[PDB]
Symmetry: C2
Subunit: 150 residues, 2 copies
């Protein structure tokens, strides 16, 4: 099939929790009500088997042909990862104050270059989940290799 390092152009949908969270189809982007005006639509180029896409997308692409389309189910391990409890940290309120941040339950904040979701605040102790937003989530893609190019 398509082997590691081959520059292919790919089309992909991709759903999480029923709703669609990512696509190269702009017509479907409007219809689902997710269309971001600052998004590069149509097929995009990648080097197959090189971490440029989710691991499970890389695998499917390696066992596909030029012009082929597949629907693929990605378990968390193959998508954005499993949720890791060690990425839930308890941070002193003062650390937020000095940075001009007012932490609020359910707020997503950037701390030291990194996004976190605020879980709770108790007694000057802020619990932050730094796991990826979609970690622990099954994603579903439809992927199509439009062309190969070497």
């Amino acid at each position: 099939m398509v082997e590691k390092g081959k520059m292919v152009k790919i089309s992909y949908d991709g759903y999480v929790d029923g709703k669609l969270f990512d696509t190269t189809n702009e017509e479907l982007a409007k219809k689902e009500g997710i269309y971001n005006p600052a998004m590069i639509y149509g097929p995009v180029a990648i080097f197959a088997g090189e971490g440029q896409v989710l691991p499970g997308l890389d695998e499917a692409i390696l066992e596909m042909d030029v012009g082929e389309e597949r629907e693929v189910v990605l378990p968390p391990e193959k998508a954005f990862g499993k949720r890791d409890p060690s990425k839930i940290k308890l941070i002193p309120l003062s650390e937020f104050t000095k940075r001009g941040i007012k932490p609020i339950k359910g707020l997503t904040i950037t701390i030291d270059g990194i996004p976190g979701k605020i879980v709770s605040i108790n007694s000057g102790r802020v619990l932050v989940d730094f796991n990826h937003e979609l970690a622990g989530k099954e994603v579903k893609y439809r992927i199509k290799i439009e062309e190969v190019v070497d």
Copy 2:
């Protein structure tokens, strides 16, 4: 010593051929003409050994303690990778015309978010090198572990 998955805050300065190309130090970036107003400066949080920094940087970090600062020279294979002959692709000039790009020898173009440097344009096809700009390059870092979160 730092354990894998451990959340650490780091600061660093990257040099190639004696020139600064990356830094968490805003002042130094401005002094050295590489300041990027879209970049977030100051210490940056990462998870040790989880591949969020260069392989050789991850290794140093695992070998280090909090508050510790060191200088390391990384071979291409522990930094941005060796030059990859398979990443030099012969792309048809028709693909440039339709995009409205004039290929110029030495110019850096983007195809689908992937940068490439134009090497030559012969027989109706453009040779493009899609290697990282610093592939094959030995790099020096100054790295400090500023703190451990936990």
